[PDB]
Each structure stands twice: as C-alpha cells, then as structure tokens.
Amino acid sequence: VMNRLILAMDLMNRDDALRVTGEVREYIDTVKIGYPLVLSEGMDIIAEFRKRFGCRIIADFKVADIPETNEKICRATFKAGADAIIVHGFPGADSVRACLNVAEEMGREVFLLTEMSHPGAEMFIQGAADEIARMGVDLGVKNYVGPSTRPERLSRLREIIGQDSFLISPGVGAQGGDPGETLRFADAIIVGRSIYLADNPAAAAAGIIESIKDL
C-alpha cells in the first residue's frame, strides 16, 4: 500500500469523513472503513469513497458469525464494492472458510484477524492467537491483522505466517504503538485517531510517512 499507511476512517459523519480522507489522500492508497461510518451513513459510502478517492477499501467488519451468516455478510460487503474484508479467526475454521469461499466467488480478499491490539485481548484471544494464525495458514489465508501494541506478538505472528503473507497492524498512535517498530514485522500500519482527530490530518499523515521513509 502507498507509504505502508492505511487510514482507519472511523469518523461517523459523511462530511467529516470525506474532508479528512481527501486531505490525506496524497499519502495513502488504502482506506479501512468500519462499522462506525457504515452504520451511520450506509453501505453506499464504500462505493462513494472508492470512486471519489480511487483508493482500495478494506471493510473492517471483524466478521464473527456462524458460516451461513458469514457468507451473507461477506456477499453484501463485496456487493457494496469493498476490496477486502477483515474476519475474526476466534469463531473457528468453518466460519473463516465461509468468508474465503465468498471472496473466491467474487474475486476479493479476506484478512484474518489473529490477535487484537487492546488490553482485553490478553484475556482470551492472545492464548488462542498462535493457533488461530496456524489455522489461517492451513486454510490458505494470505492476509493477516495483528497488534502494533505488542511487537513481540506481531513478530511471533510473522514467524507463523511467513514472509510472503501480507500483514497489517492497528494500534499505532492513539493505542500506544510505534510506526517504525511495527513495520519491522508488518507490511503496513493502520492509523485512525492520530490522523483523523489531528488539528491537521495531512501534517499528521506526513509526519508518520517521514518516519516510515527513514526506516
């Protein structure tokens, strides 16, 4: 992705989301859109962004249902124009396979979320995360999400998935993660609030990129 930086656009107002995304578009080629924006403004926002900005869109829906419902969610999301969807691995292999099947049908991609970035991830997810990652490898998953806030965990995840798999990582900035350290293991960093709540989002994005180029 452009500059190894993916914008997490979690503003809940179309006008604000469009403003900020336009201001930082010169510094990214990929926007992650999640439920805060989608549930406030509608799924039509995905195609609007994809057209206006000519970006890739990752739908951060953390799909976490039974196989049959997962299929439906994925199909609706790809129909709306998303390039990729983020899926939880904790519901197990059949749930993940359902998403992979729809992605294969529709020429899209699945990102498997393996270990989350927030403190509560330590309670249940972290102890399962290596196994979840190995399950991804065994299902043929090629795209993964793991936590900027725990680079030792992010290193272990990279170790499991290998150097060919694509790994993106949230938790940079607001949650305490560091761009450069995260990029030792991840291919791209996800950044939300540190950009979209900044007084000058373009300057915030530029500052991050300047530290990325230095690596």
Ligand X SMILES: Nc1cc(=O)[nH]c(=O)n1[C@@H]1O[C@H](COP(=O)(O)O)[C@@H](O)[C@H]1O
Can you say which residues are annotated as belonging to the binding site for substrate?
Answer: 10, 32, 60-69, 117, 170-180, 192-193
The residue of the chain with the least Cβ separation from ligand X equals 192
Helix or strand or coil: residue 83?
Answer: coil
Which positions lie near a second copy, rule CB under 8 A?
A: 10, 12, 34-36, 38-40, 42-43, 61-62, 64-69, 72-73, 76-77, 80, 88-96, 116-125, 128, 131-132, 135, 174-175, 193
Helix or strand or coil: residue 174?
Answer: coil
For a second copy, the closer of residues 132 and 205 by Cβ is 132
Query: Known catalytic residue: 62?
Result: yes
Which positions lie near ligand X, rule CB under 6 A?
A: 8, 10, 34, 60, 65-66, 69, 86, 113, 116-117, 145, 147, 170-171, 173-175, 190-194
From 62, 72, 142, 213, active-site residue: 62
Q: How far is the CB of 213 from a second copy (least distance, A)?
A: 28
Strand partners, 60: 34
What does 190 interact with, of ligand X, a second copy, none (CB < 5 to 8 A by kind)? ligand X
What does 90 interact with, of a second copy, ligand X, none (CB < 5 to 8 A by kind)? a second copy
Residue set of the binding site: 10, 32, 60-69, 117, 170-180, 192-193
What is the distance of C-alpha 167 from the center of its chain?
9
Cβ neighbours for 79, distance < 8 A, ≥ 6 positions apart: none
Which residue, 26, 27, 10, is CA-closest to 179? 27
What does 173 interact with, of ligand X, a second copy, none (CB < 5 to 8 A by kind)? ligand X
b/e 168-207 (16+ beta carbons within 10 angstroms → b): bbbbbbebebbbeebbebbbbbbbbebbbebeebbebbbe
d(CA 19, CA 75): 29
Q: Which residues are catalytically annotated?
A: 62
